[PDB]
Write a protein that binds this ligand. Structure first.
Ligand SMILES: Nc1ncnc2c1ncn2[C@@H]1O[C@H](COP(=O)(O)O)[C@@H](O)[C@H]1OP(=O)(O)O
Ligand SMILES: Nc1ncnc2c1ncn2[C@@H]1O[C@H](COP(=O)(O)O)[C@@H](O)[C@H]1OP(=O)(O)O
Ligand SMILES: O=C(O)c1cccc(C(=O)O)c1C(=O)O
Ligand code: NA
Ligand code: NA
Ligand code: NA
Lengths: 357, 347
């Protein structure tokens, strides 16, 4: 069996990492929960066992076979390289290593083969990217993809526990105390790293992450760059708009694509149905389509509203929904670890390829 | 002045029509409030003066100069032709007449000229179409429009006062009683006129109105058809995805366009700023962009996140926000009535 560590065990993703591990096919001999100094000494369950939480440090990874990181990019930057040096295989949820050419960026249903060449770190893509890749890969395999335009409808749990509690508080102030939305005080959203903060209650915020130089956000640009790496095709054009809405869990996405060859609409639907990890939920005659509230708690990615563009011959619109803390994060990560186990890839790396900070 | 009638004065839109008329430059001598058989008798205000709500009948429109209809297709299909008969000029908020080739479909800042050809009835377009037209007309004027792709983020107030209440009750049950969103009971959304109902609380519902043969909803097809008619150009390719989200008032839209000639972004921003009814709010260095919660109560349409596509030479993305009961409905209507007055078309 393995020694498995969860870095960021106390966070929103971490909680789901624990659940996914509890329900895993991974043979686990020993579990370790890591967080900041603040949580160290506190206790948390793994199934029935009480596990004492430890401080994450340069020296915390001795004896660990697999570490799952979900404690922000800065934490992965500081400590993941030390875990690799110690002989750990790291599965990282953060953005920090995703564009490093020595790091596979993996959704197992799409590009599991890229795991073969890892050097101790495997990166999980951004939550919004993962579910879009699950929906579109089966289409790409058969008809190709020329371009993608996507508008996202993103739940607040992606920004962490703080963001969840802030959203709950704001809704309660409005609905129970009669505070007007524009009078609400916010501290976290749209981005903890940015200067100004805005209410999410009864709002739609077209900012996720900070702005980059080209006036897209980092979240938008992550979708673009991650898509091309995962699909191994820099020729695919991708432009995104990423919007936070008042949803606690499950991202939805309005996705437009143009295929390389015309894709018969009903075959597109069949291909998506046949693809592992994707569930076709598309029957408009009976008002059947993916919804955020029904996706919460499932590892599947749900696709519907599938239809031709009204004018573009190769154009197709769809609606994609998935639990952003499961396939979007914790489940993708644990699925990666299971795949590494199944293919004999859980072993220390020969050469260190990551700078110690 | 004029005798003005508000049909459906008790509803979500009706209540705003009253506010807009109260604040209007339209010279009003008498105001009449019309609704259904079971509102008939109560009293609504016009400024500080009581108005008896009257039932809407075939004969209740005699003596009326201008009638503002906001009470669903049903009410407008039956009673508006009788109002035109009685010499009334009708401004219709509903979808019923919108594609009638004898009925102008008007956003005043865009195609006011179309009011000249009217024959008793003016159609106000759909809320989500109007704000899109205000934002895009200035770009079309200067560089053309080849195609539009839009994904909307629509507030619940567009589906009626009943939808607003269902939303607030649903949210309270989740946050106060701990009910799981997927277990909530729903009566209205996504569509009051469709077979099944779903919760909106902590949800996003990809259905506005009912479905058509081509698997787009009627809301989506209205955006497509009304755009062509308002801009008087059938060659503009338009496809929409319309989504309800847990917002009470103000629609937002993620809008993608391709122009006919390349349009420099700074010139695009300047053209929208210059266009009447559009306000530029776009300064990402200070996280300035349009937001539903700030747009509530304003007649303006707000545009930002304006940026070029990363690959398409003529492609442009933007974010457009406006109060759906104001510019999206009541203010557009009252603006039409004011325009008719000013251009001497109320006869
Ligand atoms: N310097 C750090 N070292 C290790 N873990 C950290 C550090 N800073 C934050 N974390 C962890 O990242 C996660 C953040 O989750 P979320 O964003 O959902 O709150 C938490 O588990 C948090 O632990 P802690 O709870 O000890 O602060
Ligand atoms: N058959 C009808 N004749 C006239 N008005 C109607 C009829 N049915 C509904 N209405 C009005 O349409 C509006 C709908 O409002 P909303 O869409 O916000 O629920 C209300 O003012 C309602 O008035 P009433 O209050 O009498 O039902
Ligand atoms: O570290 C963060 O602050 C963070 C927070 C939410 C999402 C992400 C991510 O890129 O998926 C990230 C990130 O890894 O950059
Ligand atoms: Na499948
Ligand atoms: Na065209
Ligand atoms: Na302007």
């Amino acid at each position: 069996g393995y020694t498995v560590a969860v870095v960021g065990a106390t966070g929103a993703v971490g909680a789901q990492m624990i659940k996914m591990l509890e329900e895993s096919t991974l043979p686990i001999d020993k579990i370790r929960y890591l967080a900041s100094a603040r949580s160290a000494g506190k206790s948390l369950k793994f199934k029935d066992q009480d596990i004492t939480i430890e401080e994450t440090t340069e020296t915390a990874f001795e004896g660990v076979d697999i570490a799952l990181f979900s404690a922000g990019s800065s934490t992965s930057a500081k400590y993941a390289p030390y875990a690799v040096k110690a002989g750990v295989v790291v599965v990282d949820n953060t953005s920090y290593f995703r564009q490093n050419p020595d790091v596979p960026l993996v959704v197992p249903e799409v590009n599991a083969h890229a795991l073969d060449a890892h050097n101790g770190i495997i990166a999980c893509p951004n939550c919004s990217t993962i579910q879009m890749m699950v929906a579109l890969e089966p289409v790409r395999q058969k008809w190709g993809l020329d371009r993608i335009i996507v508008s996202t409808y993103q739940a607040v749990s992606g920004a962490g526990m703080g963001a969840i509690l802030e959203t709950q508080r704001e809704l309660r102030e409005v609905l129970n105390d009669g505070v007007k939305p524009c009078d609400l005080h916010a501290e976290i959203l749209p981005s903890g790293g940015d200067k100004k903060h805005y209410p999410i209650a009864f709002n739609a915020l077209p900012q996720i992450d900070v702005f980059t130089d080209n006036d897209y956000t980092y979240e938008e640009m992550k979708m673009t760059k991650e898509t091309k790496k995962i699909m191994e095709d820099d020729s695919i054009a991708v432009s995104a708009t990423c919007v936070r809405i008042p949803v606690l869990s499950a991202h939805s996405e309005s996705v437009y694509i143009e295929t390389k060859e015309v894709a018969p609409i009903e075959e597109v639907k069949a291909a998506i149905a046949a693809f592992p990890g994707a569930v076709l939920e598309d029957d408009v005659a009976h008002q059947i389509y993916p919804q955020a509230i029904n996706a919460v708690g499932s590892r599947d990615t749900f696709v519907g509203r599938i239809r031709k563009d009204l004018d573009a011959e190769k154009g197709i619109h769809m609606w994609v929904v998935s639990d952003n803390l499961l396939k979007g994060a914790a489940w993708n990560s644990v699925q990666i670890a299971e795949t590494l186990h199944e293919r004999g890839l859980v072993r220390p790396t020969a050469e260190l390829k990551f700078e110690l900070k």
